[PDB]
Amino acid sequence: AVLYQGVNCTEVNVFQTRAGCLIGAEYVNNSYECDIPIGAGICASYQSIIAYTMSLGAENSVA
Amino acid sequence: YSNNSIAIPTNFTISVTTEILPVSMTKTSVDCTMYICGDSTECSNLLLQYGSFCTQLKRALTGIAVEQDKNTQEVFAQVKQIYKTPPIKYFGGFNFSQILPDPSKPSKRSPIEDLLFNKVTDLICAQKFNGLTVLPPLLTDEMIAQYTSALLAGTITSGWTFGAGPALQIPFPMQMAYRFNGIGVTQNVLYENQKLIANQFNSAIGKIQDSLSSTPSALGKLQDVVNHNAQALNTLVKQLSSKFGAISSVLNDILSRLDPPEAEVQIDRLITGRLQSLQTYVTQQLIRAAEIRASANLAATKMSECVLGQSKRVDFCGKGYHLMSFPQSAPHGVVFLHVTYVPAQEKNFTTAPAICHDGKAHFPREGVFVSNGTHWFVTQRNFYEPQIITTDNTFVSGNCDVVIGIVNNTVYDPLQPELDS
Amino acid sequence: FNGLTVLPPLLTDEMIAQYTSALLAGTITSGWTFGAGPALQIPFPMQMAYRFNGIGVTQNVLYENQKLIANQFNSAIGKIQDSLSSTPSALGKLQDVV
Amino acid sequence: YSNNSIAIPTNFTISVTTEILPVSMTKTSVDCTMYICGDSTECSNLLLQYGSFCTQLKRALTGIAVEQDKNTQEVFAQVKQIYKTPPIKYFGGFNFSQI
Amino acid sequence: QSLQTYVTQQLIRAAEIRASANLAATKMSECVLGQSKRVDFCGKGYHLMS
Ligand SMILES: *[C@@H]1O[C@H](CO)[C@@H](O[C@@H]2O[C@H](CO)[C@@H](O)[C@H](O)[C@H]2NC(C)=O)[C@H](O)[C@H]1NC(C)=O
Numbered sequence: 098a099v100l101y102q103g104v105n106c107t108e109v110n111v112f113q114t115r116a117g118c119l120i121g122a123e124y125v126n127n128s129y130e131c132d133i134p135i136g137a138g139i140c141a142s143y144q145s146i147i148a149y150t151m152s153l154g155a156e157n158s159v160a
Numbered sequence: 161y162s163n164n165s166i167a168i169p170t171n172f173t174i175s176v177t178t179e180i181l182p183v184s185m186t187k188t189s190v191d192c193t194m195y196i197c198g199d200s201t202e203c204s205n206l207l208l209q210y211g212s213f214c215t216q217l218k219r220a221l222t223g224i225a226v227e228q229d230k231n232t233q234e235v236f237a238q239v240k241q242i243y244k245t246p247p248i249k250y251f252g253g254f255n256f257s258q259i260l261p262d263p264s265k266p267s268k269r270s271p272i273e274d275l276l277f278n279k280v281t282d283l284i285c286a287q288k289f290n291g292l293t294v295l296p297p298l299l300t301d302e303m304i305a306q307y308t309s310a311l312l313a314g315t316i317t318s319g320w321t322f323g324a325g326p327a328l329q330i331p332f333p334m335q336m337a338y339r340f341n342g343i344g345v346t347q348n349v350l351y352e353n354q355k356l357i358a359n360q361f362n363s364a365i366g367k368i369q370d371s372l373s374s375t376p377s378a379l380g381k382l383q384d385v386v387n388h389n390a391q392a393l394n395t396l397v398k399q400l401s402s403k404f405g406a407i408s409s410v411l412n413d414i415l416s417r418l419d420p421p422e423a424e425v426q427i428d429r430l431i432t433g434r435l436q437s438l439q440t441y442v443t444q445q446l447i448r449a450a451e452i453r454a455s456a457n458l459a460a461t462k463m464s465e466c467v468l469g470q471s472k473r474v475d476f477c478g479k480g481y482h483l484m485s486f487p488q489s490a491p492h493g494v495v496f497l498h499v500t501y502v503p504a505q506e507k508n509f510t511t512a513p514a515i516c517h518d519g520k521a522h523f524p525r526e527g528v529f530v531s532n533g534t535h536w537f538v539t540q541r542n543f544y545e546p547q548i549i550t551t552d553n554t555f556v557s558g559n560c561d562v563v564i565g566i567v568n569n570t571v572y573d574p575l576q577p578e579l580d581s
Numbered sequence: 582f583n584g585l586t587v588l589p590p591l592l593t594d595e596m597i598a599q600y601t602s603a604l605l606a607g608t609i610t611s612g613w614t615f616g617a618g619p620a621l622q623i624p625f626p627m628q629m630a631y632r633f634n635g636i637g638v639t640q641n642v643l644y645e646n647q648k649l650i651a652n653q654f655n656s657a658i659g660k661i662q663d664s665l666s667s668t669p670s671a672l673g674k675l676q677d678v679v
Numbered sequence: 680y681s682n683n684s685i686a687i688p689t690n691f692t693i694s695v696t697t698e699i700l701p702v703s704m705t706k707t708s709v710d711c712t713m714y715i716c717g718d719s720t721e722c723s724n725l726l727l728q729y730g731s732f733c734t735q736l737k738r739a740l741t742g743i744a745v746e747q748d749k750n751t752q753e754v755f756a757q758v759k760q761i762y763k764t765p766p767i768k769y770f771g772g773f774n775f776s777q778i
Numbered sequence: 779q780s781l782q783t784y785v786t787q788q789l790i791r792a793a794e795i796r797a798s799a800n801l802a803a804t805k806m807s808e809c810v811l812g813q814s815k816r817v818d819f820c821g822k823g824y825h826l827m828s
């Protein structure tokens with residue numbers, strides 16, 4: 098999957114990120130640990146290739 | 161100074177100080193061929209003769225780019241669990257509104273974090289269109305804010321236990337008593353003066369906010385980093401306008417005006433000059449990256465030792481005796497709020513090394529012998545709390561003659577009325 | 582001659598010496614209190630007893646052996662002065678910088 | 680080493696050691712044009728084609744020069760009060776003449 | 779080229795000296811103004827003062 102840095106998606110599975118235009122990857126709402134860092138909070142991984150928002154960590158509410 | 165005089169504080173001041181440390185710089189990336197030659201292909205062919213300089217520059221810039229994200233992750237992502245503050249924001253009278261996240265703000269940032277963000281601020285396109293690109297940070301600002309909120313909630317609810325293992329809850333006054341025992345003052349001092357300490361803490365927090373708001377030079381370091389980066393980029397762009405020993409500084413005119421045999425000479429002057437400029441840019445970038453990496457390591461150590469625990473190192477976590485710290489996020493850096501214990505209102509006494517009684521010398525277990533002029537007592541070193549000399553707080557070692565400057569006095573025995581009655 | 586100039590330091594040697602003397606006086610008379618707040622005076626034997634307690638030795642050890650400790654400290658000071666005087670490579674780093 | 684034995688010190692020695700640390704280097708500033716060309720005007724004219732090299736060198740040297748003073752200030756100026764020793768230099772037998 | 783070489787060496791030595799000065803400041807704050815429990819930080823043996 099190719100990423101066009103700093104170029105809007107209208108000038109070139111299409112996803113728009115702050116880093117640029119990402120082609121060939123599908124966005125998934127689920128959060129995981131970062132496998133391949135892309136930038137601006139988006140990470141990519143292979144499971145086809147998916148793009149997701151990286152998860153900071155498991156939530157733990159202390160009582 | 162004297163020979164038989166000592167001074168003991170009869171009060172304390174809870175002071176909060178700020179420390180600003182840069183963490184990461186702007187991630188930049190260059191395109192060697194586009195900068196050096198632009199559209200023209202003959203220049204690119206000539207540029208190829210000089211070897212793998214462009215590859216070296218690209219590799220170095222990539223190294224700095226990944227190092228920035230590594231620095232940010234090291235400084236902030238120190239807890240694998242994110243904690244949340246309890247819904248009821250009562251902690252025994254202590255106020256944390258100024259540092260806790262504000263739900264009203266869409267950015268979910270504390271008021272101090274918002275103030276810090278606000279105080280730090282066709283050139284951009286001029287830089288971008290020439291082959292220079294800035295890259296977005298991996299961690300967005302809200303993610304850094306979330307990390308800081310998690311650390312702050314952990315250090316409020318659990319003290320220092322969450323840093324060294326599982327999180328164990330502790331009521332805030334009891335954590336206060338633990339941290340007071342850390343600096344050598346007993347718990348009753350805190351427990352009796354809880355309201356005064358809470359009021360002092362709140363006043364210090366308010367003063368910190370006002371001081372940050374009303375001083376322009378407080379955040380000089382981060383603004384200096386931003387200015388250095390922008391100035392270096394602008395200087396690099398300006399170098400394209402220099403003739404550099406050629407007849408024209410624009411390559412297209414040289415190509416369109418002149419024959420190839422001397423056109424090559426002109427493009428060689430331009431190529432070697434632009435290579436020199438690019439190498440200079442890379443070398444200063446590397447040096448600045450090393451400096452900022454050292455700063456980031458210092459910030460990470462400060463976080464681990466002052467925020468996640470109590471530190472005994474002098475002046476490492478603020479002026480005075482250290483109590484805790486609170487982290488706050490800032491653009492390209494982190495701001496610490498060191499809470500320290502400062503003695504005040506000292507009062508001046510007469511002291512002796514040991515007390516001679518029944519031919520035996522008595523020495524304080526943990527305190528010191530003070531005398532207000534007619535009577536002798538034992539007090540803690542860091543706070544004045546007179547107490548009757550007994551056998552509980554004193555230990556016996558040898559006779560009176562060995563020590564120099566011993567002073568006679570009676571030693572009360574707690575058991576004496578017990579077996580007397 | 583050739584356009585290179587050395588600029589004077591902002592702090593002259595006398596004022597640096599004054600700073601060092603101030604630090605020495607503070608640590609001699611008031612122990613470590615002056616670092617963390619207002620200066621509180623302490624007789625030097627008592628400060629020595631405190632610092633002995635810092636390393637895990639009780640105060641009576643300092644108090645009963647005061648003269649021996651003082652003599653050892655004075656002998657050490659004389660020895661360090663002689664060692665600095667008699668060795669040329671002791672100050673290698675500063676001279677190397679120059 | 681053993682299973683049920685220990686060694687306990689019975690006596691001590693007060694030791695004094697040195698440690699030398701450089702703090703600042705000599706502040707130096709250069710004049711780019713005077714060095715590169717001297718008093719010749721034509722050399723200065725040709726130097727001008729290269730542009731902001733001299734400015735960059737002067738800026739770097741100025742940064743180093745201010746950093747030296749900052750280093751000295753950080754190392755030494757850590758107390759805001761100028762304390763003074765008492766006139767009588769008696770401290771229980773401890774002798775501080777050499778320092 | 780000669781001037782740039784001089785400036786680069788000066789910058790590297792400045793980084794050297796800045797690291798040394800930071801170490802010296804830490805040593806001052808932790809050994810002179812207080813008593814340190816760090817091993818060998820303030821001299822060989824158990825530290826008393828500096
Ligand atoms: C110790 O100092 C505190 C202040 O740090 C004193 O408390 C103040 O008392 C006055 C009069 O009682 C009030 O007007 C102030 O508002 C108090 N301070 C605060 C922050 O509220 C206290 O009286 C002092 N105690 C001793 C024994 O000296």
Ligand SMILES: *[C@@H]1O[C@H](CO)[C@@H](O[C@@H]2O[C@H](CO)[C@@H](O)[C@H](O)[C@H]2NC(C)=O)[C@H](O)[C@H]1NC(C)=O
Binds near residue numbers: 257
């Ligand atoms: C904690 O401090 C905050 C601010 O320091 C207090 O909020 C203030 O409340 C008063 C009256 O309710 C308002 O007039 C102010 O405008 C508030 N300040 C801000 C910044 O919003 C708050 O009352 C204090 N106590 C608690 C329990 O939160």
Ligand SMILES: *[C@@H]1O[C@H](CO)[C@@H](O[C@@H]2O[C@H](CO)[C@@H](O)[C@H](O)[C@H]2NC(C)=O)[C@H](O)[C@H]1NC(C)=O
Binds near residue numbers: 167506507508509
């Ligand atoms: C305890 O006693 C000493 C000696 O009497 C006090 O030292 C004096 O303080 C005043 C106030 O500034 C000075 O004008 C004198 O010169 C000091 N004496 C000497 C010999 O220098 C000391 O201040 C007292 N402690 C307190 C807390 O007042």
Ligand SMILES: *[C@@H]1O[C@H](CO)[C@@H](O[C@@H]2O[C@H](CO)[C@@H](O)[C@H](O)[C@H]2NC(C)=O)[C@H](O)[C@H]1NC(C)=O
Binds near residue numbers: 532533534535
């Ligand atoms: C030193 O402190 C002691 C203990 O507080 C004082 O002894 C008490 O003093 C008060 C007022 O002077 C009397 O009402 C008590 O009866 C005293 N108690 C005893 C057991 O004697 C002493 O007066 C103080 N000395 C000075 C000079 O202030």
Ligand SMILES: *[C@@H]1O[C@H](CO)[C@@H](O[C@@H]2O[C@H](CO)[C@@H](O)[C@H](O)[C@H]2NC(C)=O)[C@H](O)[C@H]1NC(C)=O
Binds near residue numbers: 516566567568
């Ligand atoms: C502290 O008390 C001891 C014992 O009461 C004193 O030692 C006595 O001092 C008197 C007067 O000099 C002599 O007549 C006795 O022979 C001493 N007895 C012993 C066993 O030595 C001592 O002088 C007192 N110290 C002070 C400073 O008053």
Ligand SMILES: *[C@@H]1O[C@H](CO)[C@@H](O[C@@H]2O[C@H](CO)[C@@H](O)[C@H](O)[C@H]2NC(C)=O)[C@H](O)[C@H]1NC(C)=O
Binds near residue numbers: 652653690691692
């Ligand atoms: C501990 O060591 C000191 C010396 O480091 C010993 O003091 C010496 O004692 C002898 C005989 O008593 C004298 O000749 C020396 O002059 C002393 N040295 C100094 C520096 O004064 C001391 O005796 C030792 N303690 C024990 C219990 O052995």
Ligand SMILES: *[C@@H]1O[C@H](CO)[C@@H](O[C@@H]2O[C@H](CO)[C@@H](O)[C@H](O)[C@H]2NC(C)=O)[C@H](O)[C@H]1NC(C)=O
Binds near residue numbers: 776
């Ligand atoms: C403190 O140390 C100094 C020097 O180490 C001692 O001064 C010496 O005194 C003797 C006898 O008066 C002279 O022979 C030496 O020449 C002095 N040395 C110097 C360098 O002047 C001093 O006696 C020691 N004790 C005191 C209390 O000052």
Ligand SMILES: *[C@@H]1O[C@H](CO)[C@@H](O)[C@H](O)[C@H]1NC(C)=O
Binds near residue numbers: 162163164767769
């Ligand atoms: C105690 O202090 C005074 C004043 O500094 C001094 O003159 C006196 O000699 C000292 N005591 C002894 C026994 O030396």
Ligand SMILES: *[C@@H]1O[C@H](CO)[C@@H](O)[C@H](O)[C@H]1NC(C)=O
Binds near residue numbers: 681682
């Ligand atoms: C005592 O030491 C010996 C050898 O050093 C070892 O075999 C033995 O197990 C030790 N004693 C006990 C009770 O373990």
